From a paper:
Here, we present the crystal structures of human CDKL1, CDKL2, CDKL3, and CDKL5, revealing their evolutionary divergence from CDK and mitogen-activated protein kinases (MAPKs), including an unusual αJ helix important for CDKL2 and CDKL3 activity. CDKL family proteins contain a conserved N-terminal kinase domain and variable C termini.
By contrast, the CDKL1, CDKL3, and CDKL5 structures displayed characteristics of active kinases. Its nitrile H bonded with the catalytic lysines of CDKL3 and CDKL5. CDKL5 mutations, most occurring in the kinase domain, are linked to neurological disorders, including epilepsy, atypical Rett syndrome, and autism. To this end, we found that GFP-tagged human CDKL5 localizes at the basal body, as well as ciliary tip in ciliated RPE-1 cells. We chose to model three pathogenic CDKL5 missense mutations (G20R, P180L, and L220P) present in patients with epileptic encephalopathy, severe mental retardation, developmental delay, or spasms (Kilstrup-Nielsen et al., 2012).
Residue numbers in the entry: 9 to 45, 53 to 162, 174 to 302
Amino acid sequence: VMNKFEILGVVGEGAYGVVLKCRHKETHEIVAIKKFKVKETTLRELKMLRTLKQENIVELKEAFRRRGKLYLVFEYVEKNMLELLEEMPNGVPPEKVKSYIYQLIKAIHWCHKNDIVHRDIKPENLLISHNDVLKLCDFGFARNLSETRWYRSPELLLGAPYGKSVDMWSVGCILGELSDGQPLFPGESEIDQLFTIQKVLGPLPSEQMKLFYSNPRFHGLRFPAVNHPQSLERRYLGILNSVLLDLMKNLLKLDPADRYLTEQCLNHPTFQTQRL
Ligand SMILES: N#CCc1ccc(Nc2nccc(Nc3cc(C4CCCC4)n[nH]3)n2)cc1
Ligand code: NA
């Protein structure tokens, strides 16, 4: 309990709840304890965490209860990518961009090999250790395939069926943001998110446009048609080199069927080239 764990400070508080940085009084291990302000989502996530146990996935260590309140004890990692971008608001060095995107793709590759899509990859849930080791967490929106809006693919925004390609979109968004510090698609609403995406990449594919009208969620709403699209080439000139730009264009294909999945990404020149 807080019998056994000393509270060192507050890591975060939000919609997720509250995460405390704590220390075991007997062993002196430092941990992250998530306290809740039990639901199906929690049980689903714990199952996935066990399946995915690995050095690039946050470890759940134990669960306990104090007077009916659930506490989950995790591995503690010193920071997340969101905090890192606050410290470096104009982006990180190109070497660190490649290392974090490599590691993210490797972690997603492991999820996908286990038939799990994460569906909510964003800087806030990418933990980065003192040794620069990236780890994934926050599996509450994840799905097993056999059964805030800024990083979501257009097909997920529209309510379409989805597969492994959903996570590759998020990778492309993070590649850009690590390079210049700026969120690539900062929409203000679901509709404005679709607008912001097309403002860069041009009109959505035919099937997605049809989904806007067949999905009753958008009944009577105005489709956000784009005027003069900008292009990734224009958006990232002087930010991305041609090799990273090439990779980014193939992560951010509007049609999920055209996106590179993880194995193809790892065969890309971005990761296969060796500094001389
Ligand atoms: N819940 C959730 C997602 C989330 C992820 C990160 C943060 N913020 C943050 N900010 C700085 C460090 C940090 N370290 C950390 C978090 C965890 C857990 C994953 C699971 C809950 C403890 N272990 N080590 N987390 C806040 C929320
Ligand atoms: Na750490």
